[PDB]
Amino acid sequence: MMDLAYVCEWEKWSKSTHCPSVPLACAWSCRNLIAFTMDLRSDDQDLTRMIHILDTEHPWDLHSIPSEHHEAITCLEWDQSGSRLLSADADGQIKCWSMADHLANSWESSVGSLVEGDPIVALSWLHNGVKLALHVEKSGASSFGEKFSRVKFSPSLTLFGGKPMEGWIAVTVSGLVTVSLLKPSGQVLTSTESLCRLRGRVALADIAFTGGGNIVVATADGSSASPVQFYKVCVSVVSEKCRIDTEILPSLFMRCTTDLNRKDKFPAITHLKFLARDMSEQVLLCASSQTSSIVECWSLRKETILKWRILSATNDLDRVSAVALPKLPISLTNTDLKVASDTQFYPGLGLALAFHDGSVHIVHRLSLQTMAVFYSSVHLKAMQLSWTSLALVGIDSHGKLSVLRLSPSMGHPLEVGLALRHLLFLLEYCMVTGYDWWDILLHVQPSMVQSLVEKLHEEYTRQTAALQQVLSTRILAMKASLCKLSPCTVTRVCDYHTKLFLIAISSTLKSLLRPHFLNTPDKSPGDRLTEICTKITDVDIDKVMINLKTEEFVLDMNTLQALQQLLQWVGDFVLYLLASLPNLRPGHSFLRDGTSLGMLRELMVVIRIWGLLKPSCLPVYTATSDTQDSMSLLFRLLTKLWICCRDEGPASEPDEALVDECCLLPSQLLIPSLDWLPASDGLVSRLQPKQPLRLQFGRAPPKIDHLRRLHLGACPTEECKACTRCGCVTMLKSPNRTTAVKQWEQRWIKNCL
Amino acid sequence: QYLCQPLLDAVLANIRSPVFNHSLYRTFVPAMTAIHGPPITSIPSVLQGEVARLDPKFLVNLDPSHCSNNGTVHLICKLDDKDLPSVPPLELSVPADYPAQSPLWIDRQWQYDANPFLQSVHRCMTSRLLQLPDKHSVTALLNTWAQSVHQACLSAA
Ligand SMILES: [Zn+2]
């Protein structure tokens, strides 16, 4: 079923006029990063050459890049990863845009290439050779190895091991090609050579890999009287430069002209491309006249040894102004095709299409007929999908950011169980990788949340205990994000989101300590510290502190004052949590999930060592007894909660004897503060299907750092990097650098969890 | 002024510090919020003001010739008086930023010919206008142009 998300529109920016308009192209990262452009002609030329980057949660704070160019950008593509860019244009002027310092609004490009007097007709990157297969037939496989296994395409030109080289190639508009490859070192090797003896006009072309590091290219002069030649790239770096051998493939002529009825119809070629990148045995070839367009698919199946053959065509077409390809990698098996055909599952079979009128249509990839129909009530210049293709953005000849949310359901009747199963497969598609999956959280219903979180609870299981070492954080954040959309759990997502910060701060400070002389060898002091904590459930702690290998824990006596605030904070959120007993509560899930409380038991036993060793670093709380060492009697309360929680799956409500003792807490201790992470600054709690919000730019319809516990003023000054995934202020320049922890900052030096 | 130098010396010692807003917070916050109480629950407007109190005996309007919508402006004057006879209409010249500058007036010697009365009018213009002070308004020049007609009519009559 089709949904329209929003349109985010600048004020006094649209209605480009008094200029020859240009078709536009769009690009998208591996992450949720749309890179787009628009032709304006408003007293400057760089508005046409302008780069706009929109993070997927806040469509207003757009990253702006004034890409200066002598000729307007024609093709825009990203890297396979989210690290490199290309803005293709005539006569070279191509750069390499790398990410700047893990912000959200910062780029740079100090390197690139240029060719003089020769526009470029085709371009592509190099290959990596890493690819897996998606099996929707294996929904009940209950293992990530079965549903996700590598197909192992051959990596391109693996030198010095199995690592394929990095670079890109391009075919110019004349009889000339260029290659530029980045070394393992900082240098780059660029070569340029005539593709054959025939140097000529090339209207259209495409570039696609083959198995073995070779590349097959296409040609299109546009004179409508020439054969469509095909050439092969032979990579060979002969000791100083990549000498490339060229040869002619068995070519093809064109149909719809030998029938002799009408041959000068559709007089110029307008589209020539391969079906998908990295493969050159299936060619889209479309000729558009001033009225309509005609499209043909050619297949390189062996009977000449390399002969192209027609596949399919639809009923009627208008003038196509925009086209794209599906991005989800179905295992290309016919059993997968049938199990994706009987159930409503089409995430990777739809080639995007557009016309000169207000209509949005898909076309099926294998069979060129019009699969979907929608009516817009403009000619679309480009579209830009996602890997799951659950959402996309479109560029017409206006400044409107039409964002459409698709789905494989289509409105053919899917039951509730098939609604679970269609989303669970694409959830496992993103949970196996370190990717971004914002577009698949869109179509979730509030009733769908309770059904899907219960499935995701068992999705953490059924893996062989090693994947689950580090993806626990990702699944906690996953059901943090998905529970936000349900009104019953929007008051409960604070439990998940604060627990992400708790597990972020937990493991990183358990690595700073080290035994100067090793005790209990062939294992860390941390596991012995765990077992002495789980074997002693004592009310007090002065009996405990004798046999805790007190001579092993020795610090450098310098960073204890610096790390005060964190150890100020971790015992204070406990101090709040002791007073939440006599109350769906935003702190209710911690009463039954004692793993956080188990970590709280584990952390404080080494903190008390420094508290009795150097008491200047102790966290000063707000009890109404300043001479009372109340930490022993709080060990009493946490052990009283633990005997109600250390049972394996207890589901035990703590007794009222603990409740009245926790009512003695306000006699001394009062709640300092909290920090609920899930501030819904994203569009998760702002939009609705059939209820779009026409957004604008920059309208935006007690300030303490979420990561570090340093209190700021009412309107602080220090800058931050935009953690777009949850809106926590990942502040940029830490106050202490010469004496700083080198992992607690570096774990989220890039992004948040 | 007297015994306040600890407070003055603390802020200069704690300046250029990134923990400044948190060091002051840590040393100060519980003291005031505990005992004293909890927290709470075309043409410029210069000529538009100029022509507002101009005399109705002048009917000055813009020149039909020359450039428009630019810094320099020219205003041709109309005099409808039954007391005074007919004279050439006269035309001024005022550049951009009319306050704090001294404008000018056009010159045409042959228009005031064929009568020595008009020559006396021109000589009276050269007499009165050459002693006008700097940076004066258009009312002074308009009124000195107006009074010289009577000053020449009394000599003519
Ligand atoms: Zn975050």
Tab-separated table of C-alpha atoms in Angstrom, chain A residues 215-369:
chain	number	residue	atom	x	y	z
A	215	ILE	CA	34.164	-4.621	-17.445
A	216	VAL	CA	31.777	-4.649	-20.422
A	217	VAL	CA	30.666	-1.268	-21.784
A	218	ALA	CA	27.938	-0.166	-24.190
A	219	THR	CA	27.717	2.495	-26.908
A	220	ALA	CA	25.024	4.714	-28.417
A	221	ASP	CA	25.880	7.342	-31.038
A	222	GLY	CA	22.296	8.530	-31.520
A	223	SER	CA	22.361	8.703	-35.328
A	224	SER	CA	19.772	5.852	-35.514
A	225	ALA	CA	21.764	4.171	-38.302
A	226	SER	CA	24.774	2.642	-36.499
A	227	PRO	CA	25.314	-0.726	-34.785
A	228	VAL	CA	25.359	-0.783	-30.989
A	229	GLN	CA	28.959	-1.779	-30.315
A	230	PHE	CA	30.139	-3.458	-27.107
A	231	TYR	CA	33.669	-3.444	-25.697
A	232	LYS	CA	35.647	-5.219	-22.984
A	233	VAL	CA	38.153	-3.878	-20.444
A	234	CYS	CA	41.295	-5.905	-19.719
A	235	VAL	CA	42.958	-4.621	-16.545
A	236	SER	CA	46.752	-4.968	-16.663
A	237	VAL	CA	49.073	-2.729	-14.622
A	238	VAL	CA	52.410	-3.258	-16.414
A	239	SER	CA	54.801	-2.098	-13.679
A	240	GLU	CA	54.067	1.641	-13.981
A	241	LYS	CA	50.601	2.097	-15.542
A	242	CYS	CA	47.419	0.154	-16.261
A	243	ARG	CA	47.683	-0.763	-19.934
A	244	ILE	CA	44.175	-1.746	-21.028
A	245	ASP	CA	43.416	-3.981	-24.006
A	246	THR	CA	40.238	-3.327	-25.983
A	247	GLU	CA	38.297	-5.607	-28.315
A	248	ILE	CA	34.897	-5.663	-29.995
A	249	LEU	CA	32.130	-7.895	-28.679
A	250	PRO	CA	29.430	-9.471	-30.868
A	251	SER	CA	27.118	-6.480	-31.202
A	252	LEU	CA	23.427	-5.965	-32.006
A	253	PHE	CA	21.284	-3.911	-34.333
A	254	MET	CA	17.901	-2.408	-33.434
A	255	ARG	CA	14.338	-3.644	-33.876
A	256	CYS	CA	11.147	-1.715	-34.872
A	257	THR	CA	12.843	-0.533	-38.091
A	258	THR	CA	13.143	-3.648	-40.303
A	259	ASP	CA	9.352	-4.075	-40.387
A	260	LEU	CA	9.383	-1.264	-43.035
A	261	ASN	CA	5.997	0.127	-41.886
A	262	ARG	CA	7.370	3.064	-39.886
A	263	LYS	CA	11.100	3.358	-39.215
A	264	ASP	CA	11.818	7.071	-38.707
A	265	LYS	CA	9.408	7.161	-35.767
A	266	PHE	CA	11.089	7.729	-32.398
A	267	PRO	CA	14.002	9.225	-34.314
A	268	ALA	CA	16.637	9.601	-31.567
A	269	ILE	CA	17.701	7.264	-28.787
A	270	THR	CA	16.954	8.589	-25.304
A	271	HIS	CA	17.804	5.788	-22.844
A	272	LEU	CA	20.476	3.083	-22.923
A	273	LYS	CA	21.413	1.311	-19.702
A	274	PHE	CA	21.982	-2.071	-18.116
A	275	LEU	CA	19.254	-3.518	-15.901
A	276	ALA	CA	21.550	-3.466	-12.876
A	277	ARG	CA	25.077	-2.328	-12.080
A	278	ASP	CA	27.977	-4.856	-12.189
A	279	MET	CA	26.224	-7.106	-14.764
A	280	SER	CA	26.081	-6.659	-18.558
A	281	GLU	CA	23.712	-9.236	-20.079
A	282	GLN	CA	20.409	-7.314	-19.937
A	283	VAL	CA	19.973	-3.907	-21.591
A	284	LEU	CA	17.198	-1.352	-21.330
A	285	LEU	CA	16.990	0.586	-24.602
A	286	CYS	CA	14.294	3.241	-24.926
A	287	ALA	CA	13.627	5.681	-27.762
A	288	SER	CA	11.360	8.624	-26.964
A	289	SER	CA	9.724	10.881	-29.534
A	290	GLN	CA	7.951	14.177	-28.813
A	291	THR	CA	4.780	12.201	-27.995
A	292	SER	CA	5.628	8.779	-26.542
A	293	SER	CA	8.442	6.339	-25.757
A	294	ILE	CA	9.226	2.724	-26.682
A	295	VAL	CA	11.335	0.467	-24.453
A	296	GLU	CA	13.095	-2.826	-25.234
A	297	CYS	CA	15.021	-5.327	-23.102
A	298	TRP	CA	17.912	-7.181	-24.732
A	299	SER	CA	19.424	-10.361	-23.265
A	300	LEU	CA	22.916	-11.732	-23.942
A	301	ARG	CA	21.925	-15.411	-23.661
A	302	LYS	CA	24.010	-17.715	-25.842
A	303	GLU	CA	22.188	-19.345	-28.766
A	304	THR	CA	26.526	-15.489	-32.600
A	305	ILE	CA	28.070	-16.399	-29.245
A	306	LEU	CA	26.855	-13.073	-27.779
A	307	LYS	CA	23.417	-12.351	-29.269
A	308	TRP	CA	20.858	-9.927	-27.835
A	309	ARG	CA	17.154	-10.813	-27.783
A	310	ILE	CA	13.855	-9.082	-26.966
A	311	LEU	CA	11.962	-9.788	-23.716
A	312	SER	CA	8.764	-7.764	-23.203
A	313	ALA	CA	6.906	-4.473	-23.616
A	314	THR	CA	3.821	-2.886	-22.060
A	315	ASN	CA	0.729	-1.444	-23.746
A	316	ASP	CA	1.466	2.285	-23.970
A	317	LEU	CA	4.003	4.767	-22.629
A	318	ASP	CA	4.383	8.530	-22.385
A	319	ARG	CA	7.659	10.466	-22.571
A	320	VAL	CA	9.781	9.039	-19.756
A	321	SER	CA	11.651	11.693	-17.773
A	322	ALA	CA	12.867	9.575	-14.835
A	323	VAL	CA	13.753	5.915	-14.280
A	324	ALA	CA	15.481	3.835	-11.600
A	325	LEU	CA	16.039	0.244	-10.432
A	326	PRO	CA	15.029	-1.766	-7.344
A	327	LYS	CA	17.701	-2.195	-4.707
A	328	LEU	CA	16.750	-5.196	-2.535
A	329	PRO	CA	18.896	-8.255	-3.488
A	330	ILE	CA	16.559	-11.203	-3.945
A	331	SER	CA	18.558	-14.426	-4.456
A	332	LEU	CA	17.292	-14.485	-8.059
A	333	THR	CA	15.854	-17.994	-7.663
A	334	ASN	CA	12.485	-18.999	-9.070
A	335	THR	CA	11.417	-20.650	-5.804
A	336	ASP	CA	12.042	-17.297	-4.112
A	337	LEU	CA	10.066	-15.690	-6.950
A	338	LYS	CA	7.088	-17.980	-6.324
A	339	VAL	CA	7.130	-17.610	-2.529
A	340	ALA	CA	7.393	-13.840	-3.067
A	341	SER	CA	4.542	-13.995	-5.613
A	342	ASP	CA	1.906	-15.956	-3.668
A	343	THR	CA	2.422	-13.703	-0.647
A	344	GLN	CA	2.520	-9.946	-1.160
A	345	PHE	CA	6.325	-9.554	-1.187
A	346	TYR	CA	7.765	-7.361	-3.970
A	347	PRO	CA	10.616	-5.270	-2.514
A	348	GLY	CA	13.176	-5.825	-5.274
A	349	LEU	CA	11.327	-6.410	-8.548
A	350	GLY	CA	10.136	-2.898	-9.405
A	351	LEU	CA	11.978	-0.622	-11.831
A	352	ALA	CA	10.922	2.941	-11.044
A	353	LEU	CA	9.291	4.914	-13.836
A	354	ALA	CA	7.883	8.377	-14.457
A	355	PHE	CA	6.266	10.310	-17.289
A	356	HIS	CA	5.742	13.925	-18.362
A	357	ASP	CA	2.337	13.977	-16.610
A	358	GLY	CA	1.259	13.726	-12.984
A	359	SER	CA	1.407	9.949	-12.564
A	360	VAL	CA	3.663	7.559	-10.642
A	361	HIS	CA	4.115	4.081	-12.102
A	362	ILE	CA	6.361	1.110	-11.420
A	363	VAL	CA	7.283	-1.494	-14.022
A	364	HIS	CA	8.052	-5.127	-13.247
A	365	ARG	CA	11.731	-5.881	-13.758
A	366	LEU	CA	11.500	-9.218	-15.574
A	367	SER	CA	8.302	-8.464	-17.530
A	368	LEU	CA	8.028	-4.896	-18.848
A	369	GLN	CA	4.389	-4.212	-18.027
